[model samples]
Target: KNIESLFDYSAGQFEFIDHLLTMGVGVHFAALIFFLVVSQFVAPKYRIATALSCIVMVSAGLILNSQAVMWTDAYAYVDGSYQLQDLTFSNGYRYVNWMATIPCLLLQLLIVLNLKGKELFSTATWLILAAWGMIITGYVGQLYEVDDIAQLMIWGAVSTAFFVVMNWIVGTKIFKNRATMLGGTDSTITKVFWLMMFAWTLYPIAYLVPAFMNNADGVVLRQLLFTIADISSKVIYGLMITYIAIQQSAAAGYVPAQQALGRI
Candidate 1:
């Protein structure tokens, strides 16, 4: 099948995988909406963070569902024999979504940290750029020459380097600044920051799946690994951040509004 036909329709072995991803992402979108509603009642300071979190999650959901589902479905058939068939799916949209969502994710965390003026703007700018560097390099690397394993590894290494640098900034600059302001690293914010960083580390390993296992089996593994990474980084990380916001709201004398008994 031509690349265009992948988008149209093809009875692929991975149709079930497509269904699985769609439904999996559906759950995440639902949770995102639920949290967004909950954010409305959070303290004034945290409301923006919550709103942005919802925006990023929803944006990612739309992009992934549109691109990843079809991409995986197409790949199921194309790569079914553990070899490059006559076609390859467009994975560009996946990186596009990452570019948009990664910046938003960093912005969400920065907002919660309450960084202001140049400090906030500069840090956010750097983090977003760093993330873009990481993903864009990977995207180019993926498409540069799929058949050239060495080239792919080089690209992966470059992206991994960017990822490490980004994490270093987060761990040192951002986290340290927050720690200084908060008096110590024993707080929920610090814990959550580390949790997110830990989650972010998983993506590189997922990226290497193509190198480690080149077969169709590896393709499935790669897809599944990415999905898992998405849930952990976006869903779990956002939830924890929101929980922190809720706590901050409570500390500031904000309480969740009570619904009337008949509301449900």
Candidate 2:
């Protein structure tokens, strides 16, 4: 039930790719259950941040699950081994998922900072635009991965260039706003931002792997890199943001959140 099989996956490769893809689906959906009920611990204002986290979990889990289903069904058993069917097992799902979820992640970051007036308006607008810009460019660049290395490099660089701009916009804003929040340099939010950056940085690194080696081995390695990055960026990043929300809620004298902090 496919169009074009991206890789000529061997029997052995299927197990590795399939396992990781399925694992991602399971982890995210399970995290969804956690995020769904966990918002009760945060204050009303901070609950929006928790809501954003739930959005990330749902969208990412769906895409991860879709990729698994696509991969599993993209092959048919004939002889003793498997062969490509008429369908495609694409990694593009991850990029599409990122297009929705990363903006939510950024917005969650801003929500925790408690920005006021036109400050939230302007920053939110910039982040949303850059989010779409970065993801769409990366998607187009990846389309050139199997061929046209030149286009791949050019478009990938453009994507990374947008990433640099977004980091500037988000980083400077977060750092500046962090001082005004519950904690400054010593905040978990600081490490959270670092986690966000490091996780996102791995994405381009994985995307560029094909430029170095566009073979079967490289394909699997790239999947490994990408899946790992997705978990950290979305799920782990979501948890950190929720923790910050709890902190903010407790600071606001929310007893439930204070108790939640103690429970943590």
Candidate 3:
């Protein structure tokens, strides 16, 4: 069931989501350009992480761009209300975006960790699979979102199981790798890890929002939450990781990295 198609809302009710998504698309595109440009400043070692952030950034931009287009196309103003047309207003774009970008996201952590050969290969498989499973399970739950309460609860919980595994992987592997790979009292990586976790947690919460607040207002808030989560998790997260990258490269005496931070 498409929760978005469930309501016939007035223009006032729909304006909020439209403008929010409009802003959301702009921010993701800006982040994409920023990542593309900044990735050049870092050494090749850290540039991989920055480039991956660009992938996530642009993927989000595409997802939200289609969302706004489909939203307007899926409805027609009838008697001053936005009435659903025969078209389906689905969120399938997001799951497709998630499938690719989530793995890219976790891969950024590995790139920054500087894992190589067996360790990198080993860690990559586990992290990517957990991300895929999380998104797949959540996508399944959303399929049942507006129709079957029991299935929604069951699959949502299953999706959350993957979320728990994702967090566990971060807690154990990320912290250990951070200490061994980027060991210092700087605390930047630790802070960024927590920030990523905080932003990632919002996706599940946004997924559940319609379950509780099933209305036009809920639709507004759901998109709002998604936009916030996307900007913070991708753009802000990219900035922090790139900051670490620049710091590491500059301190390693990479002249370009140092010049990036200094006055011309």
Candidate 4:
């Protein structure tokens, strides 16, 4: 009954289509293989690197896509029309989401170093990496401390950051002068980018509103701020990066994915 209600709730929305493709998308499907292959292929010399890489990408993918799942009930609740079944039925969904961006950042750093780029103190790169690392560390800590609830908290924070910065950059036109940020006019890839940012922005606020309104202590003052940062960076800003990558792929006529290739 709960499962049927979940489907009935979506009706004919595009979110329903997007939800369906999680089972079919190239990146999500490939990320699972990366994890499976790591254990299957592990041996003495390469196991460490492979294991770490697998965790990174899989974790990132999990953290990236679960934005919608975590918020459906929260939205309904805020609208004064939430159902109890959405809460009860969505319980196990958290475990699947823990495998998100920390691994991706790790993999990204490996790729960066492997490309022979010197990591000597460039303020911009270091700052970005440091920021990403803190979020990763915070996420891992949350997962370690409270496995069930941590993923949602960590991911919500991640997505919030994604939205905030996207609004800062493109919405405010901060990087319009910088061709590298993204050159001229928008396209389909950019359209997808904007759509994702919209998702990130709304979802996190939905998650927090009930507490904010009811004055709940499950969220503290400092934790709330940091969580907001995490959500924006991981989910909202992350979506912008996705858009950027897609646009780059389209422009180059290259079909490579934003995900790291090779065995996990």
TM-score of each: 0.81, 0.93, 0.95, 0.31
Expressed as tens digits, the lDDT of each residue in 1-264 for candidate 3 is 868878997898777777877888899888888888877778888789998888887888888888888888888889989999877678767987898988887888777766778988888899888888889988988888888867878888998999898889866766777765442414777887898889999998888877899888888888888988988888898888888887777777788878888854
Give candidates' CA RMSD values in order: 5.1, 2.3, 1.6, 12.5
Q: Using TM-score as the measure, name the better of candidate 1 and candidate 4.
A: 1
Tell me the spans in candidate 2 whose CA falls farther than 4 Å from its real position.
Answer: 1-7, 78-80, 183-186
Q: How accurate locally, in lDDT, is each candidate?
A: 0.68, 0.81, 0.82, 0.37
Report the poorest 10 consecutive residues by lDDT, candidate 4. 108-117
Write the residue-wise lDDT of candidate 1 on 1-264 in tens digits.
Answer: 112222333344255447657866796798787786787666787677788778877886887687554555444333233222344665467777888888877887777676778998999889988999999998877764346767778998899899988888777665565643321222767777677777777777766665677555555565677777788888887886676666656555665622211133
For residue 218, give model 4's deviation from the true position in Å.
13
Instruction: List candidate 3 segments past 4 Å from native.
Output: 181-186
Task: Write out the backbone clash pairs for model 1.
Answer: none
Model 4 agreement with the true structure over 1-264: per-residue lDDT tens digits: 112123233222324423433432345446446445533332322233344444544454554355334534333432333333435333123223433443343232222121223532342244345445434443443332223344546665664464355345333322232333322323333443354355434434534433344222222222243234444434444333333433343343332321322212
Model 3 lowest lDDT segment of ten: 178-187
RMSD of 1: 5.1
